[PDB]
Amino acid sequence: GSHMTPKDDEFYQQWQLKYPKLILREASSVSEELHKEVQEAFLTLHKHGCLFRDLVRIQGKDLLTPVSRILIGNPGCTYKYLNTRLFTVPWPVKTEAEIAAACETFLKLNDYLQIETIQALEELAAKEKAQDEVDIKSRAAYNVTLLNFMDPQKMPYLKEEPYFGMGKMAVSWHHDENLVDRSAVAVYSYSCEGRDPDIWHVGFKISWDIETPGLAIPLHQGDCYFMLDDLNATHQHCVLAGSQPRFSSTHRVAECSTGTLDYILQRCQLALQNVCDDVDNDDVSLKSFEPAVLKQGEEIHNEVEFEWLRQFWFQGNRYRKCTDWWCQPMAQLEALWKKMEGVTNAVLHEVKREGLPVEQRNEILTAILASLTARQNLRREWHARCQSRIARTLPADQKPECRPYWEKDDASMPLPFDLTDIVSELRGQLLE
């Protein structure tokens, strides 16, 4: 395996022939004014300590990213990757005043990249020919940006690129996941100061394929590249380290149909439709015990707890150093989750009620047991993930908080944190 760079004569015809959906707009093609405002916003957020390495899971392993990151985008939006959900520090679409000015900048950067993306996609459809405009507009409607930083001088040893001799990797071969289908990706690259080892490169290869030589594109200060259409799906990309530190801003159309605050709040209101709601107290009484309704309730119970609450607090309130935006949302989701704990408790009581014909009972058990089985298995993995050896080495203001967590004697919670006792009883009844 080999790789092509601008020094190779075949590079330009390999790009033109087999990467027409990869666009490169060099720093000369965007306003100088913008350059300073964006690069100052990078340095500002870095100086304020807003960028964090993420505690991430790959194939059962807990690892921190080589890159320090922050997610900026629409209020209430989330982006999930490698089992970690990032919550946006929001930008001012229709928080300290300095940090808010950097988010405003990256929304301005977002607006410009959106325009450049629509134009590039309109040109490619023209060459393809030589409605669909609704598709182009939505595949360019970036709703988040994931900022990145890495100082390669701080790493003791970087992985060599394993297939084409591209040298040191900062980020390994991967796809950007959980994007809207065939949506574009726009990256602003900011370097602070065979292929050249000192200059940063983005690498590209065809999925499954290490025989076709891969492209290594140099990225100078303020260069922008665009992955269009299905490029992100059909190709892998990586980041090859240079000598200097580098920032990047990767603008994406996150697929957030189950990943906005509005969505999860409405799911919670849907679960609580089965609850008598005159007054918020400890005696939760349900309106229906139809198995489908209960199943839906316990499934929403698991979604808010694990996809939202435990994801959020696993990051140890790292958003505090940037925004307060999620503090009230997160306290309200926890109060709704608390009511659902009372729902589960209520259901448990009904299964124990003398005078419940066993086949009405067995229909109830068959509808909820998968959810509570999943609830305990995921609680063990989240409790372990919060107390792994790699997680205790973190600072005290980024340490993972395993929340919600209560002790076996806490009288405010109607059910214990560990449900194996409970779980094992219900399947005992279902076969007896």
Ligand SMILES: O=C(O)c1ccccc1Nc1c(Cl)cc(-c2ccncc2)cc1Cl
């Ligand atoms: O590349 C690495 O060596 C690496 C090691 C540990 C953790 C992460 C690593 N890189 C990496 C990072 Cl930062 C992001 C992603 C990713 C981003 C969006 N959607 C899906 C996956 C993949 C990798 Cl491999």
Ligand SMILES: O=C(O)CCC(=O)C(=O)O
């Ligand atoms: O930094 C880049 O240029 C690639 C983007 C990236 O690593 C990511 O957003 O996951």
Ligand SMILES: [Mn+2]
């Ligand atoms: Mn990437």
